[PDB]
Design a protein around this ligand. Structure first.
Ligand SMILES: Nc1ncnc2c1ncn2[C@@H]1O[C@H](COP(=O)(O)O)[C@@H](OP(=O)(O)O)[C@H]1O
Ligand SMILES: CC(C)NC[C@@H]1CCc2cc(CO)c([N+](=O)[O-])cc2N1
Length: 251
């Protein structure tokens, strides 16, 4: 159809948790809107200076006048982006809805056991898993320290609305997953919500957003734990991102 001039502001709020296809969705939204989408990748590879701001925001966000100060920081962080996905943003979906009243909301979901397994390989390995040491070695190469891991934990706790959380307990996480997804579908008006199951592809997304399907471009399939294992190993081998970045065309 016709080309229209789209506003550069948050148009889509994705409430889906990490390891539910948020990076493919990030890529898909950038393909559609030709402007950046927020993601943890954005923080890691472009705005590491944002880490302390999100930490500060989450610190303050257990609390009107205080709220507008929070909302204004949210707005600042997201300036120039057309959508949000993944931690740390997904836990703020209700506030993002107030701040951007004309934004639509997405929920990415998948089989809960697949989600947990993926989360253990990439985001939250058990502390006694030898792989955790490899993840940490690789993360140092990227310039990520304990503050980054703190942001991940605090933003997970914030999304799950838990004051603390036994990260090593699979049953706890599985139940938090189910409750989170459930709560989203109860909070957001069905008029304003689309639930995307992994594998659903362009069609239901583009219909929701009133856009044509990108011509000839397949719906992204990136950020598998196998690919992330390969990246970790390469990072440890070459000791830099820029030495290997050409081998991971997604980034
Ligand atoms: N188009 C697609 N179809 C099926 N699975 C997809 C997909 N895009 C991403 N995924 C899966 O979504 C997960 C990544 O999610 P996220 O980007 O939120 O971290 C990965 O799961 P696995 O680790 O099980 O392979 C990846 O395989
Ligand atoms: C060793 C190296 C490969 N680590 C980099 C990866 C990149 C993907 C990723 C994604 C998330 C959430 O999307 C989190 N997270 O919020 O913890 C951590 C990481 N870490």
């Amino acid at each position: 159809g016709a080309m229209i001039e789209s506003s550069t502001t948050i148009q889509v709020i994705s409430a889906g948790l990490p390891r539910t296809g948020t990076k493919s969705l990030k890529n898909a939204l950038e393909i559609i809107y030709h402007k950046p989408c927020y993601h943890m990748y954005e923080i890691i590879f472009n705005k590491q200076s944002d880490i302390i701001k999100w930490q500060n925001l989450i610190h303050d966000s257990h609390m009107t006048t205080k709220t507008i100060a929070i909302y204004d920081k949210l707005k600042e962080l997201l300036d120039g982006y057309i959508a949000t996905t993944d931690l740390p943003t997904c836990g703020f979906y209700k506030d993002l809805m107030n701040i951007y009243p004309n934004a639509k909301v997405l929920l990415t979901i998948r089989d809960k056991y697949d989600w947990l397994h993926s989360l253990r390989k990439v985001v939250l390995p058990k502390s006694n898993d030898p792989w955790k040491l490899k993840i940490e070695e690789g993360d140092k190469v990227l310039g990520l320290n304990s503050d980054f891991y703190k942001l991940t934990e605090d933003s997970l706790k914030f999304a799950f609305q838990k004051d603390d959380l036994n990260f090593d307990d699979d049953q706890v996480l599985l139940e938090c997953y189910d409750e989170y997804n459930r709560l989203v579908q109860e909070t957001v008006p069905s008029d304003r919500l689309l639930v995307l199951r992994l594998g659903d592809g362009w069609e239901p997304l583009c219909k929701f957003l009133n856009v044509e399907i990108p011509n000839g471009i397949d719906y992204p399939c990136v950020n598998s734990h196998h690919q992330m294992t390969q990246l970790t190993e390469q990072l440890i081998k070459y000791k830099s991102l820029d030495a290997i970045i050409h081998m991971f065309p997604d980034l």
